[PDB]
Design a protein around this ligand. Structure first.
Ligand code: WGS
Length: 284
């Protein structure tokens, strides 16, 4: 029975290596990674791979790994797929811990924009969770943390992290992680997966996919939001992505909004993440 070596980048930046039979489904590898992580609340998470143009795709757990990675390396990342709108309702601290690690990367990467004060508050909770109580012996007036807190670090941000860290004396890791999540969950781009698109007039937009529904960023003054229950059908054809928006009360007919995606694969990817979010957040 022939086995393929898999390498998975974990959310702490470390690499897990294992072997699966070459005709394995994605679920087989995912179960091995989750057992390694001592993760029970697995439904929120998934594995991603990078294709030819370094674009992220979700590894479908129900399909053969080889029919997804195709010509590419068996290299994956472990990621949050479905961001819980209320992380306090997760059953396990370790689930909230992995969600914190994902969100720290969301922040440092700039996928999750954040005010100065929120960057410093989130940073202060991470430090409290990881080092425990503030100690002056490690931090002088010229302290710079090993922790990456932001897309761009400043001495002012490092100072503010330390000032807030002093306020958290006696806070346990689980407690600090829950505070981190209570703040992060409120950010306007929390759990929003952004896709580049053009509207029916060729104007550049972004489509955001999240728990609450589909967001269309038209401009800074115009953001259209379609709650999942207002969405009846999602479809793709060639480079195009379509949603069927319910008739409001007393309307005879559904409305159709069409989008142009960069290519057919980008249309299919957007369709599948929308279907998965619609299903997941219909059941929560
Ligand atoms: F409305 C727009 C049209 C075209 C490009 N960008 C747009 N908005 C910028 C934001 C939208 C989501 O948050 C981060 C980027």
């Amino acid at each position: 029975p022939k086995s393929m070596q898999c390498k998975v980048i974990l959310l702490d930046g470390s690499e897990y290596t294992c072997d699966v039979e070459k005709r394995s489904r994605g679920q087989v590898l995912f179960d091995k990674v989750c057992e390694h992580l001592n993760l029970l609340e697995k439904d929120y998470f998934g594995l991603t791979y990078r294709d030819a143009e370094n674009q992220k795709n979700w590894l479908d757990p129900a399909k053969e790994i080889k029919k997804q990675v195709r010509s590419g390396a068996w290299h994956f990342s472990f990621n949050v797929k479905f961001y819980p709108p209320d992380p306090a309702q997760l059953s396990e601290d370790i689930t909230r811990y992995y969600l914190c690690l994902q969100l720290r990367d969301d922040i440092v990467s700039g996928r999750l924009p954040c005010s100065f004060v929120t960057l410093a508050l989130l940073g202060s909770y991470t430090v409290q969770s990881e080092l425990g109580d503030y100690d002056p012996d490690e931090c002088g007036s010229d302290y710079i943390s090993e922790f990456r807190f932001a897309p761009n670090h400043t001495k002012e941000l490092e100072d503010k992290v330390i000032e807030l860290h002093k306020s958290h004396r006696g806070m346990t890791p689980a407690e600090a992680e829950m505070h981190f999540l209570e703040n992060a969950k409120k950010l306007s781009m929390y759990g929003v997966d952004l896709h580049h698109a053009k509207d029916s007039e060729g104007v550049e937009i972004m489509l955001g996919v999240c728990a609450s529904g589909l967001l269309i960023y038209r401009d800074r003054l115009r953001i259209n939001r379609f709650a999942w229950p207002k969405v009846l059908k999602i479809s793709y054809k060639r480079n195009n992505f379509y949603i069927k928006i319910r008739p409001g009360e007393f309307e005879q007919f559904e409305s159709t909004i069409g989008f142009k995606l960069p290519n057919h694969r980008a249309a299919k990817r957007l369709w599948k993440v929308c279907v998965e979010h619609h299903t997941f957040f219909r059941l929560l």
